[PDB]
Amino acid sequence: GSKQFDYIIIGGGSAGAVVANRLSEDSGTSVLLLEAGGSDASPKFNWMYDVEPDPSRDGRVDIWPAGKVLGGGSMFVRGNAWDYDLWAQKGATGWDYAGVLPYFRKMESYALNELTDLWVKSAEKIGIRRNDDLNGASQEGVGYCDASQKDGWRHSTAQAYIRGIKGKRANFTLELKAFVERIIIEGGRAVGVRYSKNGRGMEVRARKGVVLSAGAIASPKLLLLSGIGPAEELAQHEIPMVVDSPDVGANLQEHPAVIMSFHVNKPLTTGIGHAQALVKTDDRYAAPNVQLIISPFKPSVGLAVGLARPESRGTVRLKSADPKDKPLINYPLLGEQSEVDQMVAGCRILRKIAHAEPFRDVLVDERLPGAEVESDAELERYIRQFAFPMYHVSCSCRMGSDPASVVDPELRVRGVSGLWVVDASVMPTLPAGNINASAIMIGERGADLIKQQAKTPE
Numbered sequence: 001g002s003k004q005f006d007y008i009i010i011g012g013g014s015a016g017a018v019v020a021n022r023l024s025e026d027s028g029t030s031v032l033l034l035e036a037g038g039s040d041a042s043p044k045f046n047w048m049y050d051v052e053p054d055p056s057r058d059g060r061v062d063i064w065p066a067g068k069v070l071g072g073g074s075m076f077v078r079g080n081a082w083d084y085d086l087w088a089q090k091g092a093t094g095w096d097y098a099g100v101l102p103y104f105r106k107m108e109s110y111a112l113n114e115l116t117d118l119w120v121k122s123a124e125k126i127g128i129r130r131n132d133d134l135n136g137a138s139q140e141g142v143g144y145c146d147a148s149q150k151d152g153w154r155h156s157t158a159q160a161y162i163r164g165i166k167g168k169r170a171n172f173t174l175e176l177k178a179f180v181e182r183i184i185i186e187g188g189r190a191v192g193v194r195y196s197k198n199g200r201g202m203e204v205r206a207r208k209g210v211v212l213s214a215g216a217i218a219s220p221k222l223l224l225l226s227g228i229g230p231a232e233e234l235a236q237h238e239i240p241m242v243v244d245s246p247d248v249g250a251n252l253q254e255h256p257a258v259i260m261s262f263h264v265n266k267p268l269t270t271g272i273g274h275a276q277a278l279v280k281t282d283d284r285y286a287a288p289n290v291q292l293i294i295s296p297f298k299p300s301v302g303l304a305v306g307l308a309r310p311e312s313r314g315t316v317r318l319k320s321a322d323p324k325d326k327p328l329i330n331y332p333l334l335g336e337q338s339e340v341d342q343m344v345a346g347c348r349i350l351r352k353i354a355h356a357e358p359f360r361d362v363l364v365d366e367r368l369p370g371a372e373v374e375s376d377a378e379l380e381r382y383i384r385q386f387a388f389p390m391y392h393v394s395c396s397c398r399m400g401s402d403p404a405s406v407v408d409p410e411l412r413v414r415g416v417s418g419l420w421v422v423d424a425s426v427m428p429t430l431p432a433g434n435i436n437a438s439a440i441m442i443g444e445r446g447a448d449l450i451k452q453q454a455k456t457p458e
């Protein structure tokens with residue numbers, strides 16, 4: 001621990017790069033950023049986290065990619081106010097829509113066709129209202145993704161936050177290929193970090209504290225390895241318990257989606273195309289529950305049915321006490337029958353749209369699901385077999401006001417001083433969209449919160 005910094009930030013992804021940039025704005029604040037990856041898929045720049053067999057999909061085992069690269073890789077932020085107001089309703093005081101909107105604006109400050117038209121026209125004919133200003137800060141209805149909306153902003157990538165400081169700020173230091181193994185906690189306070197680099201074990205110290213920005217998979221894992229988590233989990237791996245925190249690694253959420261495809265005469269994995277439709281499958285829903293997307297590039301058109309807000313929940317646990325082991329991840333992509341019902345209902349809407357004029361006037365044949373797949377049970381079969389995750393993993397280190405939450409609304413880990421979690425893991429619920437922008441926004445507001453806490457004693 002010969003080296004001492006004011007703050008140590010674990011993880012240089014979307015949120016962590018923002019925190020590093022913003023906290024080092026103060027000349028007298030030294031900042032160290034530790035990133036397991038390098039600068040500038042494959043194991044070199046992808047974690048390739050294995051997921052346990054999924055009973056909702058006959059034990060199917062998926063591989064979740066996650067950025068292992070400074071900043072990231074693989075824009076516009078149409079804030080859905082229902083999602084952030086839901087956060088505040090679940091205890092994230094100050095993180096309501098009115099609370100995050102200034103930080104989406106700060107992000108904007110920092111940043112300094114015929115087939116799609118045909119699809120949107122067909123949606124309107126079937127009765128899907130066109131999205132416009134009267135909707136407010138919802139994207140309910142059908143609209144074009146590549147457009148500027150009154151409820152949307154512009155933002156930058158995390159690589160823009162790092163480019164402005166790397167080798168330019170004396171109070172900022174960066175260690176790549178640094179695999180953080182444990183947070184060091186002494187006297188109820190996070191005082192440093194142990195990591196390995198180049199085959200050697202290192203330790204470094206923090207004067208003011210540690211910021212855990214490792215993302216929704218690695219952050220809960222790091223908390224567990226540091227003794228912060230459910231007592232049952234910690235004892236099993238004989239990790240001394242520092243904080244009994246019941247929800248570390250709980251509340252894991254991901255977006256499921258499935259592709260429909262049609263040939264015509266005249267990717268979608270992450271869920272952005274030329275046009276989208278946030279629609280309600282029933283009127284019993286308070287917010288649009290299904291997202292329909294079209295990204296039209298023998299020749300075919302690609303459509304997607306995504307579930308805006310998952311009902312299933314997963315877990316992140318340890319495989320062992322060995323820090324280099326990957327986490328144990330459980331997530332039933334379709335664990336609730338209603339999730340399938342909504343996605344089947346989504347598939348039927350996409351059919352109505354394609355069969356309605358004028359898009360029907362360019363239709364040829366349904367290609368991927370199959371025209372013969374018509375019964376609810378036949379569509380459920382197709383969904384269970386071809387559904388996929390959109391890589392929007394979040395919510396594993398829930399912020400809230402209840403004493404069971406992992407962090408309070410100021411992002412402090414309950415039970416420990418000088419320790420924050422600032423990344424997508426703190427989300428109480430997965431928003432319907434703009435995940436990466438939401439994570440950047442969390443870094444923006446989290447940096448302000450940490451700066452505020454530094455003005456006053458803990």
Ligand SMILES: Cc1cc2nc3c(=O)[nH]c(=O)nc-3n(C[C@H](O)[C@H](O)[C@H](O)COP(=O)(O)OP(=O)(O)OC[C@H]3O[C@@H](n4cnc5c(N)ncnc54)[C@H](O)[C@@H]3O)c2cc1C
Nearest residue numbers: 011013014015036066068180214215218270423424435436
């Ligand atoms: C392949 C892919 C494509 C995506 N596409 C989209 C898209 O089109 N649109 C969208 O809105 N969202 C997309 N997302 C989601 C978005 O990238 C994430 O929601 C967002 O990056 C989360 O930010 P984060 O800071 O929480 O975590 P991350 O961005 O994952 O940052 C965490 C960082 O911590 C590092 N780290 C982890 N463990 C350690 C450790 N032990 N020691 C040191 N460093 C460590 C990781 O290497 C990483 O750099 C995509 C995600 C993936 C994986």
